[PDB]
Design a protein around this ligand. Sequence first.
Ligand SMILES: *[C@@H]1O[C@H](CO)[C@@H](O[C@@H]2O[C@H](CO)[C@@H](O[C@@H]3O[C@H](CO)[C@@H](O[C@@H]4O[C@H](CO)[C@@H](O)[C@H](O)[C@H]4NC(C)=O)[C@H](O)[C@H]3NC(C)=O)[C@H](O)[C@H]2NC(C)=O)[C@H](O)[C@H]1NC(C)=O
Ligand SMILES: *[C@@H]1O[C@H](CO)[C@@H](O[C@@H]2O[C@H](CO)[C@@H](O[C@@H]3O[C@H](CO)[C@@H](O)[C@H](O)[C@H]3NC(C)=O)[C@H](O)[C@H]2NC(C)=O)[C@H](O)[C@H]1NC(C)=O
Ligand SMILES: COCC(CCO[C@H]1CC[C@@]2(C)C(=CC[C@H]3[C@@H]4C[C@@H]5O[C@]6(CC[C@@H](C)CO6)[C@@H](C)[C@@H]5[C@@]4(C)CC[C@@H]32)C1)COC
Ligand SMILES: *[C@@H]1O[C@H](CO)[C@@H](O[C@@H]2O[C@H](CO)[C@@H](O)[C@H](O)[C@H]2NC(C)=O)[C@H](O)[C@H]1NC(C)=O
Ligand SMILES: *[C@@H]1O[C@H](CO)[C@@H](O[C@@H]2O[C@H](CO)[C@@H](O)[C@H](O)[C@H]2NC(C)=O)[C@H](O)[C@H]1NC(C)=O
Ligand SMILES: *[C@@H]1O[C@H](CO)[C@@H](O)[C@H](O)[C@H]1NC(C)=O
Ligand SMILES: [Ca+2]
Ligand SMILES: [Ca+2]
Lengths: 251, 206, 118, 23, 474, 155, 6
Amino acid sequence: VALAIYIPFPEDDSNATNSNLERVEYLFLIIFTVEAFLKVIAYGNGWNLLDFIIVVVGLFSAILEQATKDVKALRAFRVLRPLRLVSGVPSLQVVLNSIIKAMVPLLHIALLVLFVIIIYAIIGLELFMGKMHKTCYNQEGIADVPAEDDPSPCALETGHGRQCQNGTVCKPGWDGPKHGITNFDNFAFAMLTVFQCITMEGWTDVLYWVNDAVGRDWPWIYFVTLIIIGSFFVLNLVLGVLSGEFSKERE
Amino acid sequence: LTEVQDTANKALLALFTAEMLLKMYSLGLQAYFVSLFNRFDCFVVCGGILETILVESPLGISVLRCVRLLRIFKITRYWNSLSNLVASLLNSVRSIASLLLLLFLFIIIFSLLGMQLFGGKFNFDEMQTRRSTFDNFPQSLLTVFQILTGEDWNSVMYDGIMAYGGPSFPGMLVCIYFIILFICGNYILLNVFLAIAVDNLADAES
Amino acid sequence: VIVTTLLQFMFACIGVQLFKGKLYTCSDSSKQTEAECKGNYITYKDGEVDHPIIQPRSWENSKFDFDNVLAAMMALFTVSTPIYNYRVEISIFFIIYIIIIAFFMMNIFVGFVIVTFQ
Amino acid sequence: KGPDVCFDNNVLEDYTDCGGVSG
Amino acid sequence: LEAEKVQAAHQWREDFASNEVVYYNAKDDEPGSQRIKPVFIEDANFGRQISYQHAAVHIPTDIYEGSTIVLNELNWTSALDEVFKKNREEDPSLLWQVFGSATGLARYYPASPWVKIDLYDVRRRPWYIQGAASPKDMLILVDVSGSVSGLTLKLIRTSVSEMLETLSDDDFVNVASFNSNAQDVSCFQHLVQANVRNKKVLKDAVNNITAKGITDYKKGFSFAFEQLLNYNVSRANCNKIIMLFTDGGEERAQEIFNKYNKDKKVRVFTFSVGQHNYDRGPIQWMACENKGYYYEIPSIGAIRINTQEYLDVLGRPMVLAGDKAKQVQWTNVYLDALELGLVITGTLPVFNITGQFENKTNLKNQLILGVMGVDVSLEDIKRLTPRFTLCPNGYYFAIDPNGYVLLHPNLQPKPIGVGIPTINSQEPVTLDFLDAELENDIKVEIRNKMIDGESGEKTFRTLVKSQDERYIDK
Amino acid sequence: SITFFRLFRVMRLVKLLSRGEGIRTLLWTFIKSFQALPYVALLIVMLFFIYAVIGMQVFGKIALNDTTEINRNNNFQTFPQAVLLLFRCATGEAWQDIMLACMPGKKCAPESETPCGSSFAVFYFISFYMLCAFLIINLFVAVIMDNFDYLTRDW
Amino acid sequence: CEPGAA
Ligand SMILES: *[C@@H]1O[C@H](CO)[C@@H](O[C@@H]2O[C@H](CO)[C@@H](O[C@@H]3O[C@H](CO)[C@@H](O[C@@H]4O[C@H](CO)[C@@H](O)[C@H](O)[C@H]4NC(C)=O)[C@H](O)[C@H]3NC(C)=O)[C@H](O)[C@H]2NC(C)=O)[C@H](O)[C@H]1NC(C)=O
Ligand SMILES: *[C@@H]1O[C@H](CO)[C@@H](O[C@@H]2O[C@H](CO)[C@@H](O[C@@H]3O[C@H](CO)[C@@H](O)[C@H](O)[C@H]3NC(C)=O)[C@H](O)[C@H]2NC(C)=O)[C@H](O)[C@H]1NC(C)=O
Ligand SMILES: COCC(CCO[C@H]1CC[C@@]2(C)C(=CC[C@H]3[C@@H]4C[C@@H]5O[C@]6(CC[C@@H](C)CO6)[C@@H](C)[C@@H]5[C@@]4(C)CC[C@@H]32)C1)COC
Ligand SMILES: *[C@@H]1O[C@H](CO)[C@@H](O[C@@H]2O[C@H](CO)[C@@H](O)[C@H](O)[C@H]2NC(C)=O)[C@H](O)[C@H]1NC(C)=O
Ligand SMILES: *[C@@H]1O[C@H](CO)[C@@H](O[C@@H]2O[C@H](CO)[C@@H](O)[C@H](O)[C@H]2NC(C)=O)[C@H](O)[C@H]1NC(C)=O
Ligand SMILES: *[C@@H]1O[C@H](CO)[C@@H](O)[C@H](O)[C@H]1NC(C)=O
Ligand SMILES: [Ca+2]
Ligand SMILES: [Ca+2]
């Protein structure tokens, strides 16, 4: 309830409380260290490793920054402290073992979602990569993508893709379909695009951009498949694996 | 209309009271309070008394009247299902208490990370109002839920992946987060649901 | 289908009692009374101080108008099919119809199915 | 050379009408 | 005098449908308000079509006719047409007579149709402001801390740039900023005359500020009070006010207010800018303890109105003066909104004196109903100085008590420049005497001796420039 | 074309799946049951087919305007494109807006030569979404149930 | 004067 107050701010402005919560983080970082060392004296396992790393990173980060006056990351670890809520209280720790022990069978399914994604990303960069960079770029004058706002890959007067009308002209440029993050250009963007794509969250849109760029005859086969072999088929296995496990428990 | 509604409630409320009151003597006081439904009935009649003595804020009155929708289902229309569903509902909700707890812990953890990680980095200088923004924990929770629901979760990815930095190299290690939330959260969510089904409906239906 | 239908009825009969008359508003944010909202105002396209636009003021009820049980009824279908003036609250209301809906749409159905397994 | 007239600091002024004293 | 008498006798009524009001709207080609169709006969002196039968009314596009306020203001401002005309027959050479009401509507005579987007507002014009309050010594405090970054920063920059347009050359201004450290935004470091040039520097410097750091109201206010106690430089020796442009906070800074103004000679006006959820409690406290007001600016639409409403607070001591505050003041030369050339405008504020005979109202009577105005074209003045009896090298010229020429052969009906134009009537034509012609040392003492209202003759040799700007003669 | 003969290489990677018993068996099993789902598959294709001919005949000539949702990439003018639009709706991709685009008042296409876009739309799309969801839950349940031995075994 | 450029 201390990490849920500090309002995170523009630039560096701070209210009295924030600094005053950085103050009590200097109490939470003298209690957690005396606890740590007093318990070390006893023994010197697993869950306790979370305690150790949280403390290490902690005191560290602070003292480091102590004189420094960019924690962010260095202080974005303390959000792992609420894991000790699970660790200490044994009421939901058993629920966590049940959850973990139910996912063990469906690791073959996590080794296959990955294979489908990889095969698709690789196939994809091979056919559609680098073709999404044009866009109706003007009004026979001099400026930027005019196409209303939505710019959508356009295709020169020879590629059967979208053809641009009016006094617009297709020409290279346009970083991308959508800030460049929804393109098969490069491999990583490709794997990610395929992934966002199989989750059935805008699969039609990627398809339309691709349809615009390379013509409509063969882009679609690749997506219909990705979806049918990627979501419906893959979706069933998890249910099948999970349900079978429940029944064992029910039994 | 307003006249009529008031006039009706005034008498309709007296009605339920006398009835419940007489039903008290015939039945065994103890067993009467025993049946969950009867008990809830008593509770909400008390609600009417409370609202009346109050009239002796509009929002509060409306809330109390929302409470009085008990009788609405008192008739237990189609109890064949109504009863089972409500009974099951109590059983079901009770059954997955701890799983729901874990889900909430996970959500809170992520929301805090969200505000730490992307909080403050969403000023893209556009009057555009972003419903999803890790500005504060309340909104943080909202953003996380939208991502979990996938309403505009891919869009929220862009915010971070275009915030910390452009669509470049170190500016994408922000995405490795919006996924860990869409697989893990959704995984836990599905686990929690199924339980409802396979582990109750059946026990109940059999 | 009928279970969900009746629920959406009762849930929204709750809405009417709680949100009636709290969505009506005017184009000019400055104005806060229906009477005040009469005439024309100025809007700067994309916050362009140099882009004045003389729009006309009007008092309009927002979407999901719980003006009567009915509209709430259809909106409830709409969720299946302002920003924080009072929205945050409505938000949670538009999350429960869900929970409850599914909760039993599944319950009655998947459990209904098993006989298929028998 | 500035104006020779100056009108401020009157004791009889209401002093009680701000923009937040009411709301 | 006929505006205070008629307004006092006015009875506030809220029903207008059964008894309509009749008037001519300036910008036109409605139940509760009848409209007049004038004849619009063409007439000289003016350069347009005018009607001498009634007075026109201009209502801003944002304000709405029909409001109980506007409609109420349209009856008690109807006996003005009788005195508007009575002025005309006595002096047929009378130019525009205007009553700029505090509601926002201006009623001027003779009636003439209004001249793309009509942004005219009678409460922002230079002739209105100079008659609505005494000169001021405003210092603008801008919060450039971290939390104001984003939309609220572009609202602050516009707000500061929009209130600097409410200052004439008789007022002295300076803009500071605090971000846990207080400094000026420009090369000034003290109060400046706030003329056309100095305001441009402040506007340019304000547009280049960046929001980053920690807010600190004590250091910001110590700088604000220190700059108001210079007395080494030229100042107005008048209304000392402070404008604080922030969003919200939790600091009251009561020690600073207890150290610098115990007797409260400095008004503090606080503006809460932008849409946020920070505490506005302390912001309202500084506006009430110090003799100020609290304003809120949540969007671009509210920037314009909220930046001229600080003048009705400054007019409170002027109202209580009585008949001693009714002196006609003349503005600098400027271009008329209704195109008539270069004109100067007389001014006279009108007070709310309802219940004056009963002697106990003192509720809204501390505010002014509006500001009167009559225009004098520079052509009328030039007709009083015959020239052809002189040689073509001699001429008359008169200047303000600021150095600005009221009439000069060099003063042209064109706005003055302030810099190089770039592409990606509102301002007075303030040309100094030393810039109208060549500058000599003897002509500086001549200029100073004319500001002091002295009378003397001097003969000497000087450098004159030909009509075309190519030669120099002695 | 040349490209097709190129993709080939990548495929080989699949052979790396013909390895671990754990992955081999699961797929083989469900694949060995993706034939005993006939009646809940012919039924689905039947649905698509019928709704499509119907659709192509009523909501067909609605003119195409890129600014709207019945654009050249999601029209209703060739059996194939209509089946693609129906697959979108089934995949739950903003089916709503497609529906609104099919209400009366839309102008008839130039080749068609606003008397277009019958109101049946609501019934169509909503009926479709519903029927589709069902038939699909039937599919999943069918498959798993049929294969409920592997899905639960004391190895 | 003729406008510049920016
Ligand atoms: C010059 O000063 C005089 C007074 O010194 C001023 O005349 C007075 O103005 C008020 C309003 O500004 C008139 O309004 C009366 O009283 C209230 C106003 O508060 C009106 O009733 C409502 O009041 C509520 C809030 O109190 C509010 O809704 C709204 O302000 C009013 N309208 C309604 C009905 O919702 C009354 O309607 C009105 N009187 C009645 C009973 O009709 C007073 O009449 C005036 N007071 C005096 C002493 O005459 C005058 O406006 C100032 N000059 C100018 C140009 O404004
Ligand atoms: C704003 O409110 C009213 C709108 O017209 C005006 O009040 C009306 O003025 C009329 C013109 O004088 C009156 O008619 C005559 O009034 C005189 C003076 O009392 C008398 O001769 C008669 O009453 C009447 N003549 C007739 C009937 O032949 C209205 O009686 C009068 N009505 C009311 C309710 O006051 C106001 O004058 C106007 N404001 C200004 C400044 O003019
Ligand atoms: C060989 O026969 C053995 C048989 C075994 C009993 O099977 C049980 C196992 C769970 C199972 C198959 C049962 C009913 C509905 C099935 C659900 C339909 C729902 O559909 C989904 C799809 C995805 C979600 C969006 C919605 O719900 C799944 C989560 C849910 C589902 C697939 C989970 C699995 C459920 C009953 C007993 O025989 C008498
Ligand atoms: C001018 O301003 C200064 C400070 O704002 C006043 O204070 C004097 O500063 C000068 C230079 O530091 C010195 O004369 C003394 O240190 C200060 N006191 C006096 C009495 O001069 C100064 O009074 C102001 N006026 C003048 C004429 O300098
Ligand atoms: C105009 O030009 C004259 C001549 O160049 C300048 O006046 C001379 O200035 C110098 C330097 O101060 C003096 O030594 C001379 O005595 C001046 N000449 C005179 C007074 O005749 C100056 O640049 C201009 N003179 C003006 C504006 O009066
Ligand atoms: C206006 O001034 C002139 C100049 O003396 C003169 O006609 C008279 O004083 C005024 N005219 C009038 C009062 O009609
Ligand atoms: Ca979706
Ligand atoms: Ca701050």
